[PDB]
């Protein structure tokens, strides 16, 4: 079954967020987690896996990947995987068996795909149609290496372009009032709200939690649409 599209006033309005949009922006800017062909070095609680990935900027960080249930964590525990996603640091707490903010320790949700058998020869393009106030003025594509790809990765790549080229998120507020990204595969679709919840704080953790289902799409099938409205 296919997720019905956003109802009247179901979408978060950026005008009702009064904190710094910077906190959303840094999730969809260049910094992100991407590791190829790694295996988890520890579990954490029931739903979580810890990975060691290269920092590049000293040597090794720990990423706490959190899924929405134990079946997901059990599945990938002992597999070689690719990890891709939006990571955070503030109020990122975990150990390998309320604590200081640690640059070598970061958190995310989902973003995990089997490595073996998932690699394409070529990078594949997936076209994105953007609607501003219902008009499709802008069309581009995002690229992936993966037969099976997390919606999270595609979401990240899409927004990253919109950040760079349409200023989707700025330091204080967005030029868009509402925004959702919609993924279509055959005649089945689902969408994410691109805007923070109302009020004066943005909880990065709570927002990213939507990726914890590890939702995947076929890169050969999927289409992407973005509906934005202006202020």
């Amino acid at each position: 079954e296919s997720q019905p599209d956003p109802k009247p006033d179901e979408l978060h309005k950026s005008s009702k967020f009064t904190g710094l949009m910077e906190n959303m922006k840094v999730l969809y800017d260049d910094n992100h987690v991407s590791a190829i062909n790694v295996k988890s070095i520890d579990q954490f609680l029931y739903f979580d896996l810890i990975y060691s990935i290269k920092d590049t900027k000293g040597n090794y960080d720990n990423v706490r990947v959190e899924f929405k249930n134990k079946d997901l964590a059990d599945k990938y525990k002992d597999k070689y995987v690719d990890v891709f996603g939006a990571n955070y640091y503030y109020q990122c707490y975990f150990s390998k068996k309320s604590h200081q903010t640690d640059k070598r320790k970061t958190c995310m949700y989902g973003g995990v795909t089997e490595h073996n058998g998932n690699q394409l020869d070529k990078y594949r393009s997936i076209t994105v149609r953007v609607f501003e106030d219902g008009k499709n003025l802008l069309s581009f594509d995002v690229q992936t290496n993966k037969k099976k790809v997390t919606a999270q990765e595609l979401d990240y790549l899409t927004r990253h372009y919109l950040v760079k080229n349409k200023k989707l998120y700025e330091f204080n507020n967005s030029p868009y009032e509402t925004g959702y990204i919609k993924f279509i595969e055959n005649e089945n679709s689902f969408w994410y709200d691109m805007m923070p919840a109302p009020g004066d704080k943005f909880d990065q953790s709570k927002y990213l939690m939507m990726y914890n289902d590890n939702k995947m799409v076929d890169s050969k099938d999927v289409k992407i649409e973005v509906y934005l409205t202006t202020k």
Epitope: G19, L20, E22, N23, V26, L27, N31, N87, Y88, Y89, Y90, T101, K103, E170, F171, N172, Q204
Partner: nanobody, 124 residues
Amino acid sequence: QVQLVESGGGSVQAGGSLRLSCAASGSTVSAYYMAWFRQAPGKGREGVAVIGGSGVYADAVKGRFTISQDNAKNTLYLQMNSLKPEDTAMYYCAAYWKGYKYHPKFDDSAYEYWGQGTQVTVSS
């Protein structure tokens, strides 16, 4: 990692202006999210301005104060116009590392480094 030293505090008759400076050593200010706070006698420390976009300002100082950041002098500035008695306070510069992918805005308790501050006194 970053050490902050304020200067420029003094007394000013209402309606005049004043510019505060905060020099930084040990790290480039571009690596930190910089902010100005102030603490009037008989009140908590409160946010004045943060660096980013074209600057984000407390309502109380909107239109009167300007924050800026000179990267090559590794210095922050607070330009204060139309000073009023209410603006009397100890003024503080603060820094939070950008590598945490989080901006505390005016949550003073989150910031990692502070300057000693400077007295601004506005006589009516």
